[PDB]
Amino acid sequence: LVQAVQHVVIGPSSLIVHFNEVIGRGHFGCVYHGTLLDNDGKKIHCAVKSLNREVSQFLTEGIIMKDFSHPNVLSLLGICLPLVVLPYMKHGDLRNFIRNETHNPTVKDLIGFGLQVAKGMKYLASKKFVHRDLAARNCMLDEKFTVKVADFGLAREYYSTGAKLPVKWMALESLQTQKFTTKSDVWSFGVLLWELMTRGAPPYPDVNTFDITVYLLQGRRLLQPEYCPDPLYEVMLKCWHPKAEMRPSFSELVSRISAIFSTFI
Ligand SMILES: COc1cc2c(Oc3ccc(NC(=O)C4(C(=O)Nc5ccc(F)cc5)CC4)cc3F)ccnc2cc1OCCCN1CCOCC1
Ligand SMILES: [Cl-]
């Protein structure tokens, strides 16, 4: 842990945290605007993730990130003895971007964001990593409109054994056994595409949190969104297959969505 922290350790001298500017705050964590300095003295706008007051939990979260080098996965700039330094994402979380009525992305752009999460998840599934909390709320969007798959971790109504669970994003086997696999990230990815094609509408509004397991066993799935092309809805239904082995891999997801995306001007 600390041998790895020391590899990505940032000097307090190199980082200025703007405590006067909070991008957001939860009970466990807080996110500030920040300026990171390189050896040439150039300034890097960043986000400083801090604990309000479980210290090793925070540092493990940031240490897992050090292994992730992909354009569709959020990177760690470093740890400062503690504060976790992340690259600043000009557009915030994906759900909030798509939910803005004045933003007008085309059906192709929304599919394009869906292909980006799929590419990132492919890379993660390759590294044997299981996300556990895939949702549009945990996908970041940078200046060049590049989706970065992330997790607000400690800094994170959509969540209900101490388990704080995102039940509406969860696979049948995960809701019934609290065990997660890459195949269960595929289910959540299906819910993520539904979210994108509805432009941040809440999944299963009419449905309660706890009751979601019996809703699904009745043979119910999210309806086809209005912007959603038919082949893309077929993809979503493959993600929500009750048996895990029948769900498309993320590699097949990149494939099928690349072919749907490529049919638009
Ligand atoms: C809420 O708004 C923002 C939040 C940001 C942010 O938050 C975090 C995201 C993820 C982590 N993750 C983590 O700390 C970890 C993680 O992500 N691990 C992880 C896990 C799996 C994976 F695949 C990749 C990474 C837990 C360690 C930590 C963060 F602090 C990081 C960087 N830039 C941000 C910009 C934001 O708005 C910009 C301003 C937008 N304005 C425009 C409109 O007006 C008002 C809003
Ligand atoms: Cl159809």
Q: Are residues 82 and 103 in the same domain?
A: no
Number of domains in the chain: 2
The domain that holds 131 is classified in CATH as: 1.10.510.10
Q: Are residues 111 and 51 in the same domain?
A: no
Q: Are residues 26 and 123 in the same domain?
A: no
Q: Is 40 a catalytic residue?
A: no
CB of 187 sitting under 6 A from ligand 1: no
Q: Are residues 156 and 46 in the same domain?
A: no
138 contacts 149 by C-beta, under 8 angstroms: yes
Q: Are residues 110 and 215 in the same domain?
A: yes
List Cβ neighbours of 92 (8 Å cut-off, separation of 6 or more): 140, 141
Instruction: Measure Cα distances from 116 to 27, 54, 113, 126, 140 in Å.
Output: 31, 32, 5, 15, 11
Of 57, 88, 119, the one marking the end of a domain is 88
Q: Are residues 48 and 127 in the same domain?
A: no
Q: Are residues 235 and 145 in the same domain?
A: yes
Q: Are residues 105 and 66 in the same domain?
A: no
Q: What kind of experiment solved this structure?
A: X-ray
Q: Are residues 123 and 4 in the same domain?
A: no
- The DSSP annotation for the chain comes to -HHHHGGGB--GGGEEEEEEEEEEE-SSEEEEEEEEE-TT--EEEEEEEEE---HHHHHHHHHHHTT---TTBPPP-EEE--EEEEE--TT-BHHHHHT-TT----HHHHHHHHHHHHHHHHHHHHTT---S--SGGGEEE-TT--EEE---GGG-----------GGG--HHHHHH----HHHHHHHHHHHHHHHHHTSPPSSTTS-STTHHHHHHTT--PPPPTT--HHHHHHHHHHT-SSGGGSPPHHHHHHHHHHHHTT--
CB of 150 sitting under 6 A from ligand 1: yes
Of 49, 67, 88, the one marking the end of a domain is 88
Nearest C-alpha neighbor of 141 from the set 188, 165, 169, 109: 109
Residue 8 Cα to ligand 1 midpoint, Å, equals 19
Residue 139 Cα to ligand 1 midpoint, Å, equals 8
Ligand 1 atom closest to the Cα of residue 48 is 30
Of 45, 65, 88, the one marking the end of a domain is 88
Residue nearest to ligand 1 atom 42, measured at CA: 91
Q: Are residues 114 and 197 in the same domain?
A: yes
Residue corresponding to tokens 């050090």: 66
Instruction: Round to the nearest angstrom and report the end-to-end CA distance of the chain.
Output: 48
User: Pairing between strand 83-87 and 78-80?
Assistant: antiparallel
- The resolution, in angstroms to one decimal, equals 2.3
Q: How many residues does the chain have?
A: 265
Q: Are residues 60 and 14 in the same domain?
A: yes
Range(s) of the domain holding residue 81: 1-88
Q: Are residues 75 and 107 in the same domain?
A: no
Residue nearest to ligand 1 atom 24, measured at CA: 150
